[PDB]
Design a protein around this ligand. Structure first.
Ligand SMILES: CCCCCC(=O)Oc1ccc([N+](=O)[O-])cc1
Ligand SMILES: CCCCCC(=O)Oc1ccc([N+](=O)[O-])cc1
Ligand SMILES: CCCCCC(=O)Oc1ccc([N+](=O)[O-])cc1
Ligand SMILES: CCCCCC(=O)Oc1ccc([N+](=O)[O-])cc1
Ligand SMILES: O=[N+]([O-])c1ccc(O)cc1
Ligand SMILES: O=[N+]([O-])c1ccc(O)cc1
Ligand SMILES: O=[N+]([O-])c1ccc(O)cc1
Ligand SMILES: CCCCCC(=O)O
Ligand SMILES: CCCCCC(=O)O
Ligand SMILES: CCCCCC(=O)O
Ligand SMILES: CCCCCC(=O)O
Ligand SMILES: CCCCCC(=O)O
Ligand code: NA
Lengths: 309, 309, 309, 309
């Protein structure tokens, strides 16, 4: 049997005992609220920060809501973290990942701008990507309303947001923003199609993210399987920015993250590959329920500081 | 027209002006002396250290000479770096890599033990591996002659020595020493056979390490292509220790390092892959002639500190 | 302090920073290799020539290897330059001075024959002299193997080779070859014993050639202090051929070359004395690292053309 | 005993057969006239030149007559030769050395300005020197009357004029004129006191210049034996300009020129020493009676061109 940490296993066993409905058995609204409730109980509380401020920027389909997190009211020029939440491009919002954003801002002492991008099925592919790209370009322009100067941007995100991280880095690589992507941090990302992977079959059930849920998100989002904005393993890696790929050993889409890190090495790009042992998908947002996952987040933070120099 | 840093280019132009005999055209003693002279003129001078001491330990063929480097006269238990010099398993000694060892000791603030392993053609494969393994096990046993206690070992080395790094970590993985390998650092290693690789053809001449020298070393050492002690890409990667793989973009054996880091990701192991841009093989020992390579070494140092947490 | 050109000073600072061992502290083959690397890395690249050909002639110990350089594939009878490399009669070979030889051949438009004479300590005094004399007489005989008829010979050489230049001219003056010495060009020669000289004390350290190296060479070669083949200031100067003596103002053996040119004037012989200002011993072979030394060599070339008519 | 060329010997025999009187036996006017007659008969005819023009300049005791020689009516800026005739500071004028001056101007393609300096015993030491210095400074100032621009000056002169050459170079070295002395050419100069020298006794009679005449000149000129303006061997040689010293092997004051060239080498100064074999003092002005002395002058010319670049 696969190795599972004791605190992780207890979390999984409690979820199994609840025996709740699948995403397909719920309404959209019920599914989104269930995710809000999961992270609300499972994650550590928000860090206190000097700045937690709602902003917005123009997008291709209207204003894109943003949330700015900063431990400092006033700071020197530096990189700005641009964050895209997970949820399959169907669920999640600025609140489901709020506490994680405050933690990243507190531990990095950098500003974090989270993106409230358009969700499927109401707005299918490529809506989320268009919004994530637009918001990152806007931050990269050091607009007056941001209140600090960006010398570069750091795309970061979990699951679907790790997909968006890579896609944004590819889009900005092809058509630069006002400053470069200095580092990207895809966290358990979907880079290659998970269908047919060994990890998908091994961890299809019982490891937080299920095969059933992956299928539900895919049907809602309707990403074109040949489009690198849907599956960025298909993109041009030859100028990828410095990268930290974090995966989880029990993740059904673990092998997609392995595939991406291998593609970067094959292209000669600098990459840190961290595969967290004995924890699942979503470990960044269950840090109270599974206290050892705070340590996993902290390893990602230490790698980011090293790769920023 | 691959990218070459200006200071790197100037060094290559001087080597081209020199236009010496090949290694195979020299006597063995001349070939070894020419490597002493190259690193002697090209590398930064030694750091001053509290401790630089010659030791030996028992090996399968007789005593193995060693050299201990430590910035501290007295130090508590901690990891000990075990270093294996490059030179194709044919050339190099404790002096060719002395200055680099003093730099590693100074910048890491950890003890370094360099291994004066037996060389081919006089001692063919697996002599060098036997000696590197034996010395590493000896250091790992916290002998009184060392004057330090090891809580773990950190194998590190450049080119052959990077080959030896991986092989030693595999041998100690299979049959543990008294403490574990807590980190390995293969620097432009030979892991897979370079014959047939795209990098070997692209950088066969004019990039410090030549295809001719690679063939000279191979003929002397006589490693079996099917033996994982000769080509450690063939070994079992499923329990590889935390790894930093450092390569050079102009290295004929660059793709061998790429292959190894890809195999570690494929096996789910934690790895930092750094491919230094615009510099050749041997960048760790040309830090005066090509001043920008000091910064490349400092990037490896920073990755080591991060991976040691 | 003494005048030092800025590019010369930078080279001396680089040598000082390297802080290498003395020749005596190296193995003999490491000492030889350090000199290969010094010239190899500091000198300008070889000129392209129509003819660069290895050959040999008989000598008293066996065959003497030679290298012919000629900008012309075929040429009529004319003077032939016979070149003897520096290195204390201990180090140096055809390759350490190869590029300089191609430059002399190109700029003079005369053939150059360089002599691979036997070295100390393996072959002590007068081995080097026997071989240089024998090769020069052989060239002077217009052998068919050379393919260039000699109407005269031009002995030339740097440091120990400048010693050989003068000794050869004295030996051929006393027992003529088939054609005369029409010009000799001792470049920073050892003519009188440098022990006790003001220049030896003034430039004992930090000026390329060191007092320690002079002593190392003297111990290996074992020249008799009373033998004019060892110290040709002791020889008969009354029929010395037309001479160009070139010295360096920062050379510990500068005063030896001053002594020789003064003895030629005392004897009524025609001599051009050129003391290059602000450069060291070996200036003929560091023409890339210290670009201004190319002009010093060109001044010697101009004096040679004038003295040949 | 000493080597004498056949053409030189016959001229000496003809002088002996004519059996003229000594300078002491003649009247001053007769002595001066015999010198005009000697060079008029013995030297090659004047070259035809575009410019042979009398000039004058201010001096410390009145105006100094000059004669300008130039193959060109109009020329670019360049060095100007400043010539001082021989004659012991007692005899000689602008006409005694006129043909030589036309030859120097024709063969160098440079302007020559000859100085008609004050003569002893009417004007004893240091009169001649004061005028030679003033005229050279005037030329060096590129005065309108000169008709061409001087970028440097070249002092040149035979016997007493070679004395003046060296003294002028020393005085301008200590107190620069408007342009530097770029080259000096003392021709059989009096630099050190000839009294006591081996050459003076060996060639005291029968070699055109006699010990009797040397003494005659000395008594008239009354140079101070301790004054470097009388005997410039006593001056500071450490900044002497590039120098060509020409002597004659049968000259009673040959050793004086040897001494000066040796002093320049001792001081580390660049110098061409040419000792013309088998000819006497005055060889520059007997080029028809002794035809081979034209070739001697032409060697000086060739050295001058080389030393000017
Ligand atoms: C019901 C809670 C599990 C789903 C939430 C989650 O685990 O965040 C994901 C985001 C994107 C993808 N995906 O793109 O497949 C999968 C998972
Ligand atoms: C004189 C050129 C540098 C060659 C020595 C060197 O650069 O260290 C190496 C060690 C091993 C291998 N190899 O295994 O191919 C290549 C290089
Ligand atoms: C490494 C610098 C010393 C290399 C040798 C060299 O500089 O060429 C010489 C040849 C002969 C003598 N000598 O006769 O003493 C000195 C020098
Ligand atoms: C027939 C007269 C002698 C010819 C030589 C001559 O008159 O040229 C000299 C100039 C100066 C000195 N001196 O300074 O001794 C000697 C000789
Ligand atoms: O979801 N759950 O049943 C939970 C909720 C809270 C908790 O502390 C542990 C488990
Ligand atoms: O164990 N816990 O605390 C939990 C458990 C389940 C959950 O959905 C969130 C937190
Ligand atoms: O005065 N002259 O022309 C001469 C003098 C001597 C001589 O042998 C020939 C010619
Ligand atoms: C061009 C080779 C692509 C990657 C091969 C691998 O995944 O091991
Ligand atoms: C194949 C040699 C050129 C380098 C192209 C690459 O980075 O893979
Ligand atoms: C370039 C100077 C001409 C002199 C050529 C010679 O006679 O050797
Ligand atoms: C030529 C006779 C002149 C004598 C000049 C003098 O007494 O100095
Ligand atoms: C450095 C020397 C320049 C001038 C040479 C001389 O004194 O004759
Ligand atoms: Na050789």
């Amino acid at each position: 049997t696969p190795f599972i940490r004791p605190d992780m296993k207890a979390f999984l066993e409690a979820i199994a005992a609840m025996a709740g409905p699948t995403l397909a058995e719920m309404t959209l609204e019920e599914a989104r609220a269930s995710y809000v409730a999961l992270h609300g109980m499972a994650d550590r509380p928000a860090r206190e920060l000097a700045v937690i401020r709602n902003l917005s920027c123009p997008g291709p389909a209207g204003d894109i809501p943003l949330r700015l997190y900063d431990a400092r009211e006033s700071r020197e020029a530096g990189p700005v973290i641009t964050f895209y939440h997970g949820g399959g491009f169907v669920i999640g919002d600025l609140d489901t990942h709020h506490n994680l954003c405050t933690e990243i801002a507190a531990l990095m002492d950098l500003p974090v701008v989270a993106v409230d991008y358009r969700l499927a099925p109401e707005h299918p592919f490529p809506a989320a990507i268009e919004d994530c790209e637009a918001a990152t370009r806007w931050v990269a322009s050091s607009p007056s309303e941001l209140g600090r100067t960006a010398s570069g941007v750091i795309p970061i995100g979990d699951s679907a947001g790790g997909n968006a991280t890579i896609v944004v880095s590819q889009l900005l690589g092809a058509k630069p923003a006002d400053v470069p992507v200095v580092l990207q941090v895809p966290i358990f990302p979907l880079a290659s199609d998970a269908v047919g992977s060994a990890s998908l079959e091994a961890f299809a059930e019982g490891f937080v993210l299920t095969k059933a849920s992956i299928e539900f998100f895919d049907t809602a989002y309707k990403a074109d399987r040949a489009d690198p904005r849907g599956f960025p393993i298909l993109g041009d890696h030859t100028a990828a920015p410095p990268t930290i790929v974090a995966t989880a050993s029990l993740d059904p889409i673990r092998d997609s993250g392995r595939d991406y890190a291998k593609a970067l090495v094959e292209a000669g790009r600098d990459v840190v590959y961290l595969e967290m042992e004995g924890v699942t998908h979503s470990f960044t947002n269950i840090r109270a329920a599974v206290p050892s996952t705070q340590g996993d987040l902290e390893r990602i933070i230490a790698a980011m500081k090293m790769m920023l120099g």
